[PDB]
Amino acid sequence: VSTLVSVRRVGHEDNNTVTALPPLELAYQPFEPEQTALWQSMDVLANFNTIQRWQLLDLKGEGVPGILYQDRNGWWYRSAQRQAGEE
């Protein structure tokens, strides 16, 4: 991507000089995945398996994927929620 990082208004005098304003400068959120890549254990998803009938998808709408296990008679769901603990 190209990101617009600096806009400046410049006036030019006739005696080959410059009348300049201080620039409006803009900063963007960076994508440096080589440094900030963090690995974390995932024990929340116990017995999740693509060999059996599990799925990361969202029912109920709700925009964040749940965990659906589906037998031929009943379906078992785990809706995504909020940890009340720390963050």
């Binding site: 017995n47 398996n49 060999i51 059996q52 296990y69 037998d71 008679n73 078992w76």
Partner: protein, 179 residues
């Protein structure tokens, strides 16, 4: 020359729907109670959850159910046939095991009277189930059908003590005829 019927029995639904003075209980909340402590019971009669009484089964968690208490004979009118005999029973333990894990469970009745559960996913006893002599003589309205999980005691440090705490239900797929 027969009427071939399938019936599903959820044992946590059965144990929760016992009458009062017969001790209704949650199967998921009373298995990890009995696994954690040494011994106990849950309910009474034939719809009870306890440990085995005899030798070599003291560390085996047995979840028994009665057949007349299921009232399968009320699912169809008596005008179709008064003879209703079991053809095949399969067990399903929902979402318990991975693709490379095993359960050891024995489904018996009080030869062809017992059945060993291995994967618990529409699991019959057999390596191949062919209807080409399983369960001749067994009526749907008499008897009791128990399911024994061996080594299921945590103070004795058995395997499947940690595994039975993560148990959701026990599902029995009873197939029977109406001749």
């Amino acid at each position: 020359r027969a009427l071939e019927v399938e019936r599903t029995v959820s044992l946590a639904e059965v144990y929760a729907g016992l009458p009062k003075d017969n001790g209704p209980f949650s199967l998921a909340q009373e298995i990890d109670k009995l696994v954690s402590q040494g011994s106990g019971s849950a309910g009474s009669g034939n719809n009870n959850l306890a440990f085995g009484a005899g030798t070599d089964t003291k560390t085996s968690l047995q979840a028994s159910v009665s057949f007349a208490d299921l009232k399968i004979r009320e699912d169809y009118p008596a005008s179709l046939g008064k003879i209703r005999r079991i053809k095949q029973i399969s067990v399903t333990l929902p979402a318990l095991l991975g693709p490379y894990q095993d359960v050891q469970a024995i489904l018996s009745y009080g030869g062809c009277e017992a059945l060993a559960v291995s994967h618990g996913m529409n699991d019959s006893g057999q390596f191949q189930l062919d209807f080409n002599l399983p369960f001749e003589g067994i009526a749907i309205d008499q008897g009791t059908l128990t399911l024994s999980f061996p080594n299921a005691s945590m103070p004795e440090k058995g395997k499947q003590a940690t595994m039975l705490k993560t148990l959701n239900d026990i599902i029995l797929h009873i197939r029977y005829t109406i001749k």
